């Protein structure tokens, strides 16, 4: 329900020069995931693939992990745990790995780990960090968001932030970045609309 704490959202590139990257996908009607650099905001469709790129200047130590966590973007809602609405929580869309209440899933990684924090009650999802493939400059993780922003009983039209943290095997934070998310039926159109408020 309510958490007694709120995760920090402060960008931290750290010693390994950690940044996020996104595909430059544009805003055509078919696009299922598109990122606004001006808004630092991902627009994506429910349950579709959202590529998030990890960029580092140097290789993290062995055993490093990558955690994703959602919080409400507006400070007034930040103590409220981000979770799926009742409708989606009960629907039959289980992949056999993710808890039904969790908003954020990782796709295509059998080493995915999900956490219900016993103290803060927040949900998160973790994968081992892996260096880029040969000929590549970044590591891609495929996320899925399993509720719409408009889902009542869940996000209730409230914007969220995804916080990505790079975590080492001794408990230190190696890096952190974040981006706003809107999960919606028409990411391309919605991105143009929201960017129109600029200019």
């Amino acid at each position, epitope marked *: 329900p309510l958490s007694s*704490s709120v*995760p*920090s959202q402060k960008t931290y590139q750290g010693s390994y020069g950690f940044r996020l990257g996104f595909l430059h996908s544009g805003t055509a009607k078919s696009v299922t995931c598109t990122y606004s650099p001006a808004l630092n905001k991902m627009f994506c469709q429910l349950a579709k693939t959202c590529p998030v790129q990890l960029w580092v200047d140097s290789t993290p130590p062995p055993g490093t992990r990558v955690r994703a966590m959602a919080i409400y973007k507006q400070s007034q809602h930040m103590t409220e745990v981000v979770r799926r609405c009742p409708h989606h929580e009960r629907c039959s869309d289980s992949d056999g790995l993710a808890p039904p209440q969790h908003l954020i899933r990782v796709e295509g990684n059998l080493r995915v780990e999900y956490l219900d924090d016993r103290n803060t009650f927040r949900h998160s999802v973790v994968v081992p960090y892996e260096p880029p493939e040969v000929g590549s400059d970044c590591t891609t993780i495929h996320y899925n968001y399993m509720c719409n922003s408009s889902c009542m009983g869940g996000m209730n039209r409230r914007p969220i932030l995804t916080i990505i943290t790079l975590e080492d095997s*001794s408990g*230190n*934070l*190696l890096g952190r970045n974040s981006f706003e998310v809107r999960v919606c039926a028409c990411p391309g159109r919605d991105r143009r609309t929201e960017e129109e408020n600029l200019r």
Partner: nanobody
Framework: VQLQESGGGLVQAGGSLRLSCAAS????????MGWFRQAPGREREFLAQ????????YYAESVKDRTTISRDNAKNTVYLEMNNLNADDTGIYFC????????????????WGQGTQVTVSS
């Protein structure tokens, strides 16, 4: 980077100790922290570790039942609480930061505090 412990001093037998450690710099909130103690004659001993966010903790088995480690990153401070103290709890208590050799080790810590004396007395 520059660690300071507080809360030491005389403690009644059966009472509890409440220590804290804070660093001056914003890099504190990215570091796991640890608490150690060293009794006269004996080697330095691991007590508890907590990760950068405070969500994850680990205790030495010998003190686990009556020890709590916590932190407040807003205030850049980590806390150690230990209950039901006895004579063998007397010693110098150290705060350390940025472990590089995993969980519950005495080696591999980048920063160390100067330590605070705790004396269990009747």
């Amino acid at each position: 980077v520059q660690l300071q412990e507080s809360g030491g001093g005389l403690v009644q037998a059966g009472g509890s100790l409440r220590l804290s450690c804070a660093a001056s710099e914003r890099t504190f909130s990215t570091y796991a922290m640890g608490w150690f103690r060293q009794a006269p004659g004996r080697e330095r001993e691991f007590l508890a570790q907590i990760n950068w966010s405070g969500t994850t903790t680990y205790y030495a088995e010998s003190v686990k039942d009556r020890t709590t480690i916590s932190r407040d990153n807003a205030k850049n401070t980590v806390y150690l609480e230990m209950n039901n103290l006895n004579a063998d709890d007397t010693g110098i208590y150290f705060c350390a930061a940025h472990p590089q050799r995993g969980w519950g080790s005495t080696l591999g810590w980048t920063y160390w505090g100067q330590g605070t004396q705790v004396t269990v007395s009747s």
